[PDB]
Amino acid sequence: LVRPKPLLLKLLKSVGAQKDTYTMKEVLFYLGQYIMTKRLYDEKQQHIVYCSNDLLGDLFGVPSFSVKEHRKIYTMIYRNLV
Amino acid sequence: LTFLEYWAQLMQ
């Protein structure tokens, strides 16, 4: 379905993803694993994700975000897809 | 909720 642009593809490959084309659900799976494994989420309010100085901040263009902002996260992702 | 529980909410 979707083809990540190169920076997002690099993030997905760092957690094991090997393909060029993914479903959105698989992009989301790998991105959650990226966040989890790099400990980017706040340990007390775990919907807060810190990304400034990680590749993810560059991708999204924000220094932090909340997981609860669903429409914003979809939008940011799709700016990194073709 | 935990991170992955919020992320599930995002995915569903």
From Swiss-Prot, chain A:
Region I is sufficient for binding p53 and inhibiting its G1 arrest and apoptosis functions. It also binds p73 and E2F1. Region II contains most of a central acidic region required for interaction with ribosomal protein L5 and a putative C4-type zinc finger. The RING finger domain which coordinates two molecules of zinc interacts specifically with RNA whether or not zinc is present and mediates the heterooligomerization with MDM4. It is also essential for its ubiquitin ligase E3 activity toward p53 and itself. Induction: By DNA damage. This is E3 ubiquitin-protein ligase Mdm2. MDM2 RING finger mutations that failed to ubiquitinate p53 in vitro did not target p53 for degradation when expressed in cells. Residues 1-82 are annotated as: Necessary for interaction with USP2. Residues 1-75 are annotated as: Sufficient to promote the mitochondrial pathway of apoptosis. It comes from the Eukaryota. The chain holds residues 27 to 108 of 491 of the full protein. It is linked to Seems to be amplified in certain tumors (including soft tissue sarcomas, osteosarcomas and gliomas). A higher frequency of splice variants lacking p53 binding domain sequences was found in late-stage and high-grade ovarian and bladder carcinomas. Four of the splice variants show loss of p53 binding. Belongs to the MDM2/MDM4 family. Interacts with p53/TP53, TP73/p73, RBL5 and RP11. Binds specifically to RNA. Can interact with RB1, E1A-associated protein EP300 and the E2F1 transcription factor. Forms a ternary complex with p53/TP53 and WWOX. Interacts with CDKN2AIP, RFWD3, USP7, PYHIN1, and RBBP6. Interacts with ARRB1 and ARRB2. Interacts with PSMA3. Found in a trimeric complex with MDM2, MDM4 and USP2. Interacts with USP2 (via N-terminus and C-terminus). Interacts with MDM4. Part of a complex with MDM2, DAXX, RASSF1 and USP7. Part of a complex with DAXX, MDM2 and USP7. Interacts directly with DAXX and USP7. (Microbial infection) Interacts with herpes virus 8 protein v-IRF4. Phosphorylated at multiple sites near the RING domain by ATM upon DNA damage; this promotes its ubiquitination and degradation, preventing p53/TP53 degradation. Autoubiquitination leads to proteasomal degradation; resulting in p53/TP53 activation it may be regulated by SFN. Also ubiquitinated by TRIM13. ATM-phosphorylated MDM2 is ubiquitinated by the SCF(FBXO31) complex in response to genotoxic stress, promoting its degradation and p53/TP53-mediated DNA damage response. Deubiquitinated by USP2 leads to its accumulation and increases deubiquitination and degradation of p53/TP53. Deubiquitinated by USP7 leading to its stabilization. The gene is MDM2. It is found in: Nucleus, Nucleoplasm; Cytoplasm; Nucleus, Nucleolus; Nucleus. Ubiquitous. Isoform Mdm2-A, isoform Mdm2-B, isoform Mdm2-C, isoform Mdm2-D, isoform Mdm2-E, isoform Mdm2-F and isoform Mdm2-G are observed in a range of cancers but absent in normal tissues. E3 ubiquitin-protein ligase that mediates ubiquitination of p53/TP53, leading to its degradation by the proteasome. Inhibits p53/TP53- and p73/TP73-mediated cell cycle arrest and apoptosis by binding its transcriptional activation domain. Also acts as a ubiquitin ligase E3 toward itself and ARRB1. Permits the nuclear export of p53/TP53. Promotes proteasome-dependent ubiquitin-independent degradation of retinoblastoma RB1 protein. Inhibits DAXX-mediated apoptosis by inducing its ubiquitination and degradation. Component of the TRIM28/KAP1-MDM2-p53/TP53 complex involved in stabilizing p53/TP53. Residues 1-82 form the SWIB/MDM2 domain.
